Ligand binder design. Sequence first.
Ligand SMILES: NC(=O)OP(=O)(O)OC[C@H]1O[C@@H](n2cnc3c(N)ncnc32)[C@H](O)[C@@H]1O
Ligand SMILES: NC(=O)OP(=O)(O)OC[C@H]1O[C@@H](n2cnc3c(N)ncnc32)[C@H](O)[C@@H]1O
Ligand SMILES: [Fe+2]
Ligand code: NA
Length: 566
Amino acid sequence: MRVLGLNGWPRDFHDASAALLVDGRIAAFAEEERFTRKKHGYNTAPVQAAAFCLAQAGLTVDDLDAVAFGWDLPAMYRERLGGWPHSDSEALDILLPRDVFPRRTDPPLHFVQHHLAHAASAYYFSGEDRGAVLIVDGQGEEECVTLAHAEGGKITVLDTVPGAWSLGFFYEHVSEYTGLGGDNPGKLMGLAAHGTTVDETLSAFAFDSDGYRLNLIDPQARDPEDWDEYSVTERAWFAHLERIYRLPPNEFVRRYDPAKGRVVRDTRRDPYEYRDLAATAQAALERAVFGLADSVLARTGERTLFVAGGVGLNATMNGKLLTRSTVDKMFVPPVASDIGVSLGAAAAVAVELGDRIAPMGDTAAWGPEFSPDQVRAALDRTGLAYREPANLEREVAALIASGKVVGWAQGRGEVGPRALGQRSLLGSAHSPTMRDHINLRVKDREWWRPFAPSMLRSVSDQVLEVDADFPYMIMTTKVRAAYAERLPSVVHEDWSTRPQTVTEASNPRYHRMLTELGDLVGDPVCLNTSFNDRGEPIVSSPADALLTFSRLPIDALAVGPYLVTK
Ligand SMILES: NC(=O)OP(=O)(O)OC[C@H]1O[C@@H](n2cnc3c(N)ncnc32)[C@H](O)[C@@H]1O
Ligand SMILES: NC(=O)OP(=O)(O)OC[C@H]1O[C@@H](n2cnc3c(N)ncnc32)[C@H](O)[C@@H]1O
Ligand SMILES: [Fe+2]
Ligand code: NA
């Protein structure tokens, strides 16, 4: 079967994306923001991402057996907006505009329950026949948590938690309260290790062995004038935090900056001042989820755990889940957030049509790639001089070994928020000055943000405490004795690191470059951060890469077989 999965809708939506399954295989998968250059893919059908999928597979809508959407959108409309006004045909015209998607007839349209879509994106691509399922996000149609049993190709829901008790909204609200912003919860997670936890209840959570309780909020609270509990939970958390925490909310400031010639946005207070709040929210989140995970694992008698939903992006929480006595194996896809429900809706539908889903297999590289000719055309448009090295990977390894920052744009773009050696900025892992240099000079980040390493899977057992696959950087782990001080640029405040392990099959070029680098600095390990400037999505096209390269004080850009130096 050929099944196009979608997420993204013109009214109050985020993370638009499209995924195409052909006979259970990912033929193409990408997020709208990569094409639009607008972060988060807000308020739009995944027009460009879907147009990419179809071109990639050489298909039209008429070649599709089915189109799948990662929410029960009709049910949200009937319940929250007093009616679903669209025929399937009208819904498809919005999701796949005829001016971009010509079609003779309509593919069958499927709406998939949001948390089922999350779950499908974990289970079906895990390569495990059975396990416990834990979906935690902001909110699907109603529930914010889902506990389910995956076995024999089936996903059976055991329990759910109402939206008002969302851990995602909670975490997002705290993140906003600190001035890091609700759109950057990952930064709250990074700040956490710099703070101290005094009281992980936040005077709101009560924890038990099966999860958590929130007596700060009626669990049946509902916004009558919206379709999620976000505004309800926002008012309750903001009021509560202001009562119990010594600092009021951080405010955003908008002022004209004559140096930039623009009105810029800033925070009234340094978010670092809220580090104790961050540490406390992280602890509260972990403890709640721990109970949830223990609870679903015991009920199902499983020892493999599947996690998805936005909160599943909490790599710190994930790393700790994995070391837990109740867990033997974990799979979390690179697309745990709503990005992944296009793929998940497609999988749910394809499985229903009798297809069998292939494991993702240690790569997230499903986006667009570009031929040498296409890269060259982008290069020649700019009139920059460049070379085509006889051995690009050797030369890059040497650049990195010497303390330079190299941009690396190769093959299919990765899907998800992490750069994984398709669109990455590379640097020395062994340098005690590289972290400060990249934070302050290159990626315009706060001094307290850590970086993550890429390393050969072949040496990861000696470097990391745990010997498992870490293909997605979706999980943190402790660093071993020998290396905790050998790799200063990729270690965090709490002695953790967020690793990507690289198999030769998953990325031969990247694998060969790291191998080359290993011969030079002892360990085939480098710093790998996302290839983008502060206000933009990760670069996708060779024009994107060139543009970002031009405004960052980095040393070199390795794009396709070509090498560009500053
Ligand atoms: N449907 C729907 O809710 O979207 P979704 O499934 O994509 O999850 C979004 C949620 O993930 C939360 N979230 C994102 N990153 C997070 C992190 N590192 N730690 C905790 N929560 C996080 C974030 O606070 C937000 O509330
Ligand atoms: N490849 C790629 O995606 O590079 P990126 O630098 O964009 O990494 C993503 C995020 O992980 C955060 N991060 C890195 N190491 C970490 C650690 N040990 N613990 C928590 N967060 C970490 C880091 O601060 C950043 O916010
Ligand atoms: Fe979600
Ligand atoms: Na364990």
